[PDB]
Amino acid sequence: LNYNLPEISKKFYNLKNKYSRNGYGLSKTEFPSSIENCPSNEYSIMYDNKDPRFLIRFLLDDGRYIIADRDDGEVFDEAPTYLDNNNHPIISRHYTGEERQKFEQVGSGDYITGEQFFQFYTQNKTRVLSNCRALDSRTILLSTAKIFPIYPPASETQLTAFVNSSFYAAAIPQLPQTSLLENIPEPTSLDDSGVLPKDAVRAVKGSALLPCIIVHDPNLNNSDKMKFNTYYLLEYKEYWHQLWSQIIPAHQTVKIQERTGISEVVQNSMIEDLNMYIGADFGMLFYFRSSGFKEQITRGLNRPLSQTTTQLGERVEEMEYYNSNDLDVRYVKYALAREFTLKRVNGEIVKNWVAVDYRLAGIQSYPNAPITNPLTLTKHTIIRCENSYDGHIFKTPLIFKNGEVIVKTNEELIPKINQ
Amino acid sequence: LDFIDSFIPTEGKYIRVMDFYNSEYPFCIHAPSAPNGDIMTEICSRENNQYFIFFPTDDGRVIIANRHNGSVFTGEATSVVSDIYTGSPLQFFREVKRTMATYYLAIQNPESATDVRALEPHSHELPSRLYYTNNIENNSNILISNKEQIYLTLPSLPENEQYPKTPVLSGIDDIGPNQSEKSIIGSTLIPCIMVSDFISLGERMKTTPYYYVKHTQYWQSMWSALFPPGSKETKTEKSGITDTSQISMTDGINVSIGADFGLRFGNKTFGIKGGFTYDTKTQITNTSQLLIETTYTREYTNTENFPVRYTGYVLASEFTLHRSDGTQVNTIPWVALNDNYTTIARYPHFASEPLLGNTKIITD
Ligand code: NA
C-alpha cells in the first residue's frame, strides 16, 4: 500500500541557505550569535556553518508543515515575544499542535535550470522566516513581516532562501496487506463454546502512519522515538467478537444479555495515547494534538470521520430468543469487532483498542442447517446505555438465519426510522 | 462463498429524500426547477426536485446537489437558495448526526469559523424556505430525517499497478518501443459538478453523478541511435507539459500542474484535493508557478570500445477523465514529462551507461 507521504516528510534534511558562500545553514551549535542586534539563548534556532540540524517536515492536512529535529525531538516554534523591528524569534519547543508551530513552505525560483529554492511563511503569508542580518555569519532564525517581492530582486530575500542538502532517512514501518473478513465461525458440537476473541481470525482493512509527535510512548525517550520510530503504525482490523454461547433447550425462551460498544476506560486510554477515540456512529474522533492529521489518518485507516459529537460507550441489552426446534441446540452469536493496534517500527505492539459494533451481528448453531430451524429474537430491551444516539430496538419477532449478518439499520426498528 | 463484506449502506454514497422530523404533514425538501431559486419545503412528490446527492469533501463537509438540474445548496443572507456550484464557501455544508436517524445541516460563516448556523423551516403546515438559526442545542426543529435512501452503483475502478518497467532492446537495430507498457498508479472519484462535458448537469446527476480520473505512468521514447565507440553525440530532449495540454486539463477537471510537478487545484476541486492526491498517489504543489514545456540538448558519450545501441526514455504521467460507463471524456492528451526520471535502454545489455555531457536549453 501507499500512505502517500511527500519526500520531505520521509527524510531529515539539512537545510542550507541558497546564497551562502561558506556553507551556512540551520544549526544546533552551542555557541552564541555573533551579530550585534541578534541575541541568542538556549531556545534559539541557530544559523551556522557547523553542527548542522537534520529536520523532518510532517505534513498536516491543510498542507502546512511541522518542523521537527532528529536529535532532541522538539519542533520549530514562532515565539510571541518581540525583538527589534517587531520580529518574532524562532525557537525550539515541545510539540503542542498550536498555530505557532505550523509553517507553510513556498517554492520559487528557476525550476527549469534547477535553481529553485523555498521559503517558510507564517500567519497566512504575512510573515516570512529569515536569518537575522547575516548570510555567512553565526546568527539566529526569526520571523519578519518585512516581505519583499521577488521582482525586482531584493537582497533581503536572500536571507530567506533555503535548499535541501544531506539527509537521514526517517524510520517508516511497512504497511500490511489487506485481507477479507471470514464467515461466522460454526460450532462443531453441543460442547463447542465457539471461537473466543483471543483466537478469532483478524482481517486487515486499513493502516495509517502516525508522526511520533502525536504518539505517547513513555517507554522511549524523545530522541530514540524521533530517530527510530519517526512514524508509528496504526492498523485497523476486523474480527467476529463472540457475545454469548449457550445451549438452548427445545421450545424454550431464554434471556440473554448482550454487551457491546466500548468502555470509558478504553476510550480514555486511546485519548491519552493518540488523542483519538470512537464516536457513537463508529467513526473516528480527534482531539487537539492529532486533529491536524485526521484526514490523512482516516483515508489510510479506511474508517470515516465521525459525524457526531457523542462519544461511544458501553451498551448492555437484554434479548429473548426462542428455539423452535424439537431438540437442544448449541447457539452462539458474534458481533463485528473493530480493532485498532499501535505498533512500533520493529513490529512491537504498544496497545490495542477494540470497539464492538452491535449493528453487524449473526448467529450459528449445532446442529447446523438444514437440520435445525433458525433462532428467533422475540424481545428486545436496552438495559444500560449512557447516551441516546441509538435508543432503537428491533421490531420483534426477528429471525436470525445461520451465517446471515443482520444489519440493524436494514431492519424495522422501534421507534420507526427512514419512514 | 467464503468472504463476508462488512460495508454498511449508510457509510456509502446514495440518493436521498429529505423531510423535517417534527413535521406531521408530508412535506419534503424541494429544489426549484430553474437553475436558480429558493430551496423550499413542498409536498413530497417523488420528483427529481426532491432527490439529492451529498458529495463528501476532504474535511467531512458535503456539497448538496439535486437530481433534477445539478444545482447545489447555496447559503445566502437569511435563507438557503439553489444555484450553480462554483466552489464557494457558502456551498459547503456539514451533516451533524444528533441521533442514528436524525441530523441537522450546519453552515459556518466564512468570515468566522465560530459563527455556525443550522437550517430550519418557519412552518410545518405550509411551504417554507430554509432559514438560519443559532439555537442548536436541544432544538428539534432543525432535525432532518431521510425519507428515502437509494444507493448508487459506482463505476468499476482499475487495480493499482506498480511503477512501469524500462523497455528492453532486442538487438543493435532495435530502437525499442515508442512507449513502454502503461502502468496504472491510481484513480479517484470526482463529482459530475466539477468537470466539463457535453452532457447537461441534470443528465449527469441521473446517469453518471460520479466521474473518475485515471493516473497512468509509462516511459516515453525521446531518441535512439547507434553510438560508435568513443563517440560523443548531442540529443534533443523535452520535459514538462504543452500549453494546450495544461489548458485542456484545467478546463476539464479544474486541475493544473505546478512547476514542482505538484497539482494546482482550482476553486471547484480545492475541497477534494486531499482525496484526489491520495487516490492518485500525487502531491499538491507548493509553488505558484505553472509547469511549462522545455526543450533540452544533452551530450551523450559512448565510453565503450564497441558500437552500442542507446535509446533515451523519459517518465510520463497521463491523466484521463472518464464517465461512469468508462468512456474517456478528454480528446486532448493530459501528459506531463519529468526529466528528473530518465532511463537509457541499451544493447548490448551489459554495456555501460552513457557519459552525460553539457546540457543547454533551446530558446526557439
Ligand atoms: Na559590541
Contact A61, B274 (CB under 8 A): yes
Cell numbers at residue B112, please?
468566522
User: Is B252 in a helix, a strand, or coil?
Assistant: helix
Dist CA B270 CA B173 (whole Å): 49
CA distances from B108 to B87, B90, B114, B130, B204 (A): 15, 8, 7, 15, 29
Residue type for A314, please?
A: E
CA torsion sign, A231 to A162 to A130 to A120? negative
Concatenate the DSSP letters of all residues of A282-333 into one string: S-EEE-TTTGGGHHHHHHHHT-PBPS-SPBP-EEEEEEEEE--SSS-EEEEE
Instruction: Please measure the distance between the N-terminal and C-terminal CA atoms of chain A and give it in whole angstroms.
Output: 41
DSSP letter assigned to residue B287: B
Output phi, psi for A70, to 5 deg. Answer: -70, -25
Contact A117, A162 (CB under 8 A): yes
3-state SS record for A101-138: HCEEEEEEEECCCCEEEEEEEECCCCEEEEECCCCCCC
Residue A252 has a CB neighbour count (10 Å cut-off) of 11
Angle at B350 between CA B346 and CA B354, to 5 degrees: 50
Contact B24, B30 (CB under 8 A): no
Residue type for A347, please?
A: G
List CB contacts of A7: < 8 A, sequence separation 6 or more.
none
Q: A407, B9: Cβ pair inside 8 Å?
A: yes
Contact A135, A34 (CB under 8 A): no
Instruction: Please measure the distance between the N-terminal and C-terminal CA atoms of chain B and give it in whole angstroms.
Output: 64
Interface of A with B in 367-396 (CB under 8 A): 388-392
Q: Which domains does chain A have, with CATH numbers?
A: 10-171 (2.80.10.50), 172-419 (no CATH)
> B247-278 burial by CB neighbour count: b if 16+ within 10 A, else e?
ebbbebbbbbbbbbbbbbbeebbbbbbbbbbb
**Whose CA is closest to A167, among A22, A52, A24?**
A52
Pairing of strands B14-20, A406-407: unpaired
- CB-nearest to B146 from A61, A280, A418 is A418
Contact B249, B256 (CB under 8 A): yes
**Whose CA is closest to B138, among B94, B97, B93, B98?**
B98
Interface of A with B in 331-360 (CB under 8 A): 336, 359-360
Contact A204, A178 (CB under 8 A): yes
Contact A44, A91 (CB under 8 A): yes
**Whose CA is closest to B324, among B69, B154, B151?**
B154
Residue type for A113, please?
A: T
Say yes or no: A181 contacts chain B, CB-CB below 8 A. yes
User: Is B281 in a helix, a strand, or coil?
Assistant: coil
Residue in this structure with the C-alpha cell 507548493, named with its chain if needed: B286
Residue B47 has a CB neighbour count (10 Å cut-off) of 16
> B337-352 burial by CB neighbour count: b if 16+ within 10 A, else e?
bbbeebbebbbeeebe
Would you list the domain boundaries of chain B? 1-150, 151-364
Half-sphere exposure of B156 (CA within 13 A, CB side): 2
Dist CA A99 CA A79 (whole Å): 11
H/E run at residue A12: strand A11-17
User: Is A96 in a helix, a strand, or coil?
Assistant: coil
Inter-axis angle of helices B273-280 and A294-301, nearest 10: 40
Angle at B161 between CA B163 and CA B223, to 5 degrees: 35
Dist CA A48 CA A296 (whole Å): 35
Ligand 1 midpoint to CA A51 (Å)? 25
**Whose CA is closest to A129, among A146, A145, A142, A116?**
A142
Output phi, psi for B89, to 5 deg. Answer: -55, -30
Dist CA A31 CA B193 (whole Å): 59
Q: Which residues of chain B approach chain A closer than 8 Å at the C-beta?
A: 2-6, 8-11, 58-60, 95-101, 103, 145-149, 259-260, 274-275, 277-278, 281-284, 286-289, 292, 294, 361
CA distances from B328 to B213, B220, B277, B321 (A): 9, 21, 20, 6
Resolution in A: 2.4
Dist CA A393 CA A414 (whole Å): 5
Contact A314, A259 (CB under 8 A): yes
**Among A112, A240, A311, A338, which would you mutate to test the B interface (most chain B Cβ atoms within 10 Å of its Cβ)?**
A112
Cis ω before A153 (30° cut-off from 0): no
Half-sphere exposure of A172 (CA within 13 A, CB side): 20
